[PDB]
Amino acid sequence: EMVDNLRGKSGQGYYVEMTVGSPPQTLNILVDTGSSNFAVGAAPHPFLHRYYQRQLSSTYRDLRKGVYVPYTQGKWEGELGTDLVSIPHGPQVTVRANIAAITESDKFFIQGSNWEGILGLAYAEIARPDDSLEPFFDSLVKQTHVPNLFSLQLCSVGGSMIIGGIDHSLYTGSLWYTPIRREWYYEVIIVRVEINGQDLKMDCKEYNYDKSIVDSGTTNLRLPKKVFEAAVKSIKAASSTEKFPDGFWLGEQLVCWQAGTTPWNIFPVISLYLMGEVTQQSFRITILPQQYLRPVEDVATSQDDCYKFAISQSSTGTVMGAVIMEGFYVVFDRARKRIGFAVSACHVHDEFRTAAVEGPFVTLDMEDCGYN
Ligand SMILES: CCCCCS(=O)(=O)c1cccc(C(=O)N[C@@H](Cc2ccccc2)[C@H](O)CN[C@@H](C)C(=O)NC2CCCCC2)c1
Predict the structure, then answer these.
(1) Virtual CA dihedral for 176, 189, 233, 304, nearest 10 degrees?
(2) Which atom of ligand 1 is nearest to the CA of 122?
(3) Is 298 a catalytic site residue?
């Protein structure tokens, strides 16, 4: 009953229905493995269809403490409190959890996105104001018998968040696991990067400067400057049969082709090799251009199919965002401190190429690829 419990619009996040308060107030909540605060609009905003009304909830408790949260994109401030929370299309339980009532925000809420709040599913260590503010999923596990694990299948868009388990109907082939290096973000280690089978030939610590995270709340694949520049150079070379403006590669400008004629074949596959659970072993996940060229829906341009380049530069480490997670089933195995990847039942791919998760691979170089 949890399958297909996510919705979204491309590039605007995936959200699950939740209720807060007594009696329950229904809100759509963005699922974010890249943060650890549960926060909801709690005052009028031009882009909010509805918001949390604390005065109507008998079970609301004010914590008399403000909080401020800056993201890569956007920021908000609010008042901390606790209240009862449920997930209608998740486990059938009710938990009391911390909630940040957003009273002011800047470039956070998105016009027409259909969500009114955000569920930070990462660890207390990056919670604001500090790590003593217990994250929602921690409260969920403490207060119920739900297993300490959840999985995400991100595919108008939809998908599934399976809480407490793994649904075999959502993937094919094998699940490969990479260790969670540190429990704050869902931090992982990338050991090798190839573009159309060609190694970028970098010291592997560069791939994880200064960290690499799995982040459902970030749209793009974000790469450290040095890695980004090398990637773009190789993708340009592979697709050189056509030339695009530098603004396209900066992720700022659209590229369009006549409807139905996108030249997928001139764009390379990208392989990210992730540290395995055994010494010097790895597996790779392979991303097709259908993933890193993000379609931008606009009726005005609909004579064409237009895309944004959904790989962009980072100064804060690698971010494996939605572009990467789409077409994979991703298991956040908190209990065993590992992340699993498998090919998703909802894959794009064409008649020539298919996204993959495969291994094992062995590395002779004994260097630790972690930055710290
Ligand atoms: C021209 C290129 C544009 C690229 C846009 S893009 O793809 O980066 C990009 C595109 C869309 C969103 C974001 C983005 O910052 N995502 C937020 C959540 C969010 C979701 C929806 C709207 C606004 C925000 C994550 O939480 C980001 N996760 C960590 C990286 C993070 O910043 N964690 C915080 C650490 C400090 C405490 C709070 C959590 C980035």
Answers:
(1) 50
(2) 39
(3) no
